[PDB]
Structure 1
Amino acid sequence: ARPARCYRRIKGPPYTREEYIHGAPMIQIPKFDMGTTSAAARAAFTMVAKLVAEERGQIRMQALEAARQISSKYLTKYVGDANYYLRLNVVPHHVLRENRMLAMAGADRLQEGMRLAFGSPAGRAARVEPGQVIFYVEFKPEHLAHVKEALRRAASKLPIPTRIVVEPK
């Protein structure tokens, strides 16, 4: 897997319609809403933390999942799943392409160089704008320090700069 800097910049149109894309990769994110998702339970919480993007860019699906585990594991063992709701707000609809000489990947991949340079599907990413909310945490005001620490941990696994915004519901 190439460095994420190869796929950070938004350089072309979105590539999402999977009826026209051959071999479009499946989304390997198992869960998007962590904690207590039921609306009756979330009325206990009263504070909202948002990990907001600062630059527009593309976040790979593996980077989204990596930030998801480190943040959710920390809130699991420092806050308890019954004391928070954590949602990954974005979905990686954009399909990433790569142009490399490979195995049986179609007949036109055997031609080296920039001839027939349209790449094959190499992953998925989310295209985000500035101010877009990446992670959404509903929580109670006593655990504000822990939720910031978990969100700061998730920020360390993301390719673009992000800032934490804390506001009440």
Structure 2
Amino acid sequence: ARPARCYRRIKGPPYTREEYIHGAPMIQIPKFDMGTTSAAARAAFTMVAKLVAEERGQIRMQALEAARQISSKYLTKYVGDANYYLRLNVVPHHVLRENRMLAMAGADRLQEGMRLAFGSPAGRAARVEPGQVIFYVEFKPEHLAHVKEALRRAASKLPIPTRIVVEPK
């Protein structure tokens, strides 16, 4: 895959209508809510931590997934699934394109260079704004250090600067 800097910047309109996009990729993220998802048991949790974007840009689906695994694995190992709720708040609706000569992908992909330069689908990304909430964690106040560490580890995998915001529910 290309470096994420190639697709970090928002440079055009959103590309999301899958009934018009040919060969649109599937969303590979297997689940979006972690931990104790039922609201009856979330009533125990009183602290809210939020990993929040600082700049405007695009996060790739693989980057979101890697942050999700690192944060969820840390939270399971050190807080236990019965003591937290973790939600990846954004969905990668945007479809990324790449212009490259390749295999059987249309007769217009066999012409080299910038001739017929509209690329084929290459992945998915979530277009985010400043102050947008990327990760949302509900937790009991005793696990604040572990939750902040999990959010830091998740933030290490993302292409844009972020911050952690802690507050009461």
TM bin (shorter chain)? over 0.9
- Following superposition of structure 1 onto structure 2, how do residues 1-169 of structure 1 map, counting pairs within 5 Å? 1-169=1-169
SS of alignment partner, residue 135 of structure 1: strand
Question: Residue 52 of structure 1: CA displacement?
Answer: 0.3
Q: Which runs of 5+ in 2 are unaligned?
A: none
Distance, in Å, in 2 between the alignment partners of 1:105 and 1:114 is 16
How far off its partner does 1:156 sit? 0.2
Task: Please report the TM-score for the alignment, with normalisation by the length of structure 1.
Answer: 1.00
Shift of 1:167: 0.3
Q: Which runs of 4+ in 1 moved over 6 A?
A: none
Shift of 1:67: 0.2
Identity of aligned residues (%): 100
Instruction: Give the CA deviation at 1:151.
Output: 0.2
Q: Secondary structure at the match of 2:68?
A: helix
Displacement, 1:107? 0.7
1:43 Cα shift? 0.3
> Cα distance, 1:15 vs. partner?
0.1
Inter-partner Cα distance in structure 2 for 1:163 and 1:39? 26
Alpha-carbon shift at residue 6 of structure 1 (Å): 0.1
CA–CA separation in structure 1 for the residues paired with 2:168 and 2:116: 53
Calculate the aligned-residue CA RMSD, in Å. 0.2
Q: Deviations over 1:83-126 (max 9, x none)?
A: 00000000000000000000011110000000000000000000
Helix, strand or coil at the partner of 1:40: helix
Size of the aligned set, in residue pairs, is 169
| SS state at 1:41 partner | helix
Distance 1:82 1:60 in 2: 29
What secondary structure does 1:7 align onto? helix
Counterparts of 1:47 and 1:155, CA distance in 2: 19
Q: What secondary structure is seen at the aligned counterpart in 2 of 1:48?
A: strand
SS class of match (1:159): coil
Please report how far the alpha carbon of residue 129 of structure 1 lies from its aligned counterpart in structure 2 after TM superposition.
0.2
CA apart distance, 1:38 = 0.3
Deviations 1:140-166 (A, max 9, x none): 100000000000000000000000000
- Tell me the secondary structure at the aligned position of residue 137 of structure 2: strand
Distance in 2 between residues matched to 1:121 and 1:143, nearest whole Å: 41
Query: Residues of 2 paired with 1:115 and 1:99: CA distance?
Result: 10
Question: C-alpha distance in 1, partners of 2:67/2:39?
Answer: 25
Kindly provide the CA deviation profile for residues 24-83 of structure 1, in whole angstroms up to 9, marking residues without a partner as x.
000000000000100100000000000000000000000000000000000001000000
How far residue 18 of structure 1 moved from its aligned partner, in angstroms, is: 0.1
Cα distance in 2 for residues equivalent to 1:79 and 1:46: 15
